[PDB]
Point group: D2
Chain length 210, copies 4
């Protein structure tokens, strides 16, 4: 038995204020340094308990520790995708090209219509959660869904390639209750290059994965 | 637009009575022909609604339809993994070798410790759900977790390689309320070569996705 | 400190085979002696942990232990209402009268419309759960809802007066996957006298719990 | 048939700035006028769909509409309890007497032990939700629990007599990520007069409902 590899906080791919005016520095700071850090620490702490259990040192509530692992792992991986999904206005914003634009044209009937559907998915998350654009390994097509918290409504298989955090902490300081305006403005920092790089990996690796 | 690719019910890799005496024919029949078919039909039905919305013919409750998609897609993919995860005793059962056994030693301290943990995870799912052995693309390590329903507690990233269905319909006609005995018996039909193939694909393809 | 009062498994109000042919003896036996008993034990086990935590004897995961309490307490109270909600065919079945019929006409446009809606609610629970007819203390009207597991989608305030268990263990041995047939057959053992009494209590007692008199 | 009685947004028992310095005016105002109002509308909108369905005027997804009703009704009743559970500091805060103090002594081993447990329950809500002190009709005793969102982990029977909102919108503008500090400060505005009156009604009324 070798000890588990610890999860690590991935640094932001841009400065804390690089997403202004659309997302303010203070949100980015809090979001990355308080919130994301906590998921990393929480996922590791769950695995530490599992380890002490396996080594016969303690007897854990397997369901409880696994619920802790699930929520914190999911928070960790969802944000790890969230950050590079965005970029400073210029590098971020506008409309996609390449392979992403092609499937969006094919599945959703154009960016316009995709954007409307994704925005509606994000805006209408009940409570806190995510709007998610995912690659389906079973059909090699794009799917849009919601995730509640970090780990509710998410499924096996589906590979998130573009996600928006619609937890209240993601916008409240700036947009107050107005999640709709947040989602509208988030489009101006979407890093279509990062998304494109993900659809590439998925088209190559996801079906041959399942 | 191109109309979404439909999901389809996979055939079982063996006859309905082939996992006897561990899982009786009537369960396998009902489970595949009734339950799994419902998920295929529901996942498609959800995507038909999204299509009509995209064609501008109807307006949908995006949240509601994506919850339907989520549950049925999850049910479909989880069962698609579940069937080939099992095999008629001989091909099914026993103790794993290869890379599966290798990381089972590294992560869990051996087959018996792993078996005990996986079994406890499976047995203690609250309500209906799944015990899941998954490959973590962020650490390239095994993780065990539970899923409730098909689409609760599941996270992005984690690739399920071995799953056990602990919904009541999976065992009740034979084991009645005794999920524990069903879980103990299920080990005798696990298709470890299938699990091995899945882990190999996961080691090859999963990490370069996130 | 004296701490907590324990939950106990109630007896059924009738023999295990008393709801036949609509619900078979085997289901009633397993459901009561194994499933319901398990919730009683689970709720008590959670309260024992909280106790030890409060005495400083251990330090629990409060979230985890409260999740266990929630699920098992909910299972216990839901089955506690479920059993007397039914009665052997004769006392059970048929159509309600009294205050329940009055509110069903007002809220739902009659019994046939109510039945169609309640049945749809029960039949379409995603995964395992309950169909629930409840009294709303804020409006003193009936409401129908679903509950998933025992403790998901349930809200504060609403007082369940008629519930149907649509967990798979409630019907599978007899109806197999055909939850629809089970739901249809279940109407034949509804104890409307029990539902009526619950509504009487709700009309008298529920509103003041929330809107102070 | 009679059209349903609509839910209405109650006024607060005090002005938006009356809970300062513990909860700032801007939070109280947004929380009441935006958040609570939205639940009232959401619960009414779900009931209207049910009505139109019953009148044979529209098609509904019964599950979806009932999920909408559940969430919004729950948000409404929980905030309806939340507001009078608080009072301007002076009338609010301090230490309970009467029947509430008596049960706190007998069950939790006194106020400080109760406060520590309730605070722990509130602080550790996973995602958004509520810390709840409820009266249990089966035992005529107090119980503590968490609720996630407004309508997850709540059970039948239990009557909330004291609740704390730990949705991020309840604290984020003032306390940022520091929910712990919010929970600690909230004790200074607890209206124990209100809690005592709720308990007295529950002692009188709750058990016979079941
Ligand atoms: Fe976040
Ligand atoms: Fe299944
Ligand atoms: Fe049951
Ligand atoms: Fe709130």
């Amino acid at each position: 038995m070798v000890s588990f590899k610890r999860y690590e906080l991935p640094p932001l791919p841009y400065n804390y204020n690089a997403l202004e005016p659309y997302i303010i520095e203070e949100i980015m700071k809090l979001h990355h340094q308080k919130h994301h850090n906590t998921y990393v620490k929480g996922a590791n702490a769950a695995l530490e308990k599992i380890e002490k259990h396996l080594k016969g040192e303690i007897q854990i509530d397997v369901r409880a520790v696994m619920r802790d692992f699930s929520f914190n792992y999911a928070g960790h991986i969802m944000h790890t995708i969230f950050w590079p999904n965005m970029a400073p206005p210029g590098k971020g914003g506008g409309t996609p090209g390449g392979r992403v634009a092609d499937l969006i044209e094919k599945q959703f009937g154009g960016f316009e219509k995709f954007k409307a559907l994704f925005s509606a998915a994000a805006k209408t998350v009940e409570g806190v959660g995510w709007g998610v654009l995912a690659f389906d390994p079973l059909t090699e097509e794009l799917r849009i869904l919601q995730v509640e918290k970090h780990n509710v409504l998410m499924t096996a298989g589906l590979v998130p390639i573009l996600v928006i955090d619609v937890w209240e902490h993601a916008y409240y300081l700036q947009y107050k209750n107005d999640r709709g305006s947040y989602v509208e403005n988030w489009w101006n920092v979407v890093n279509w290059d990062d998304v494109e790089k993900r659809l590439e990996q998925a088209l190559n690796n996801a079906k041959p994965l399942y």
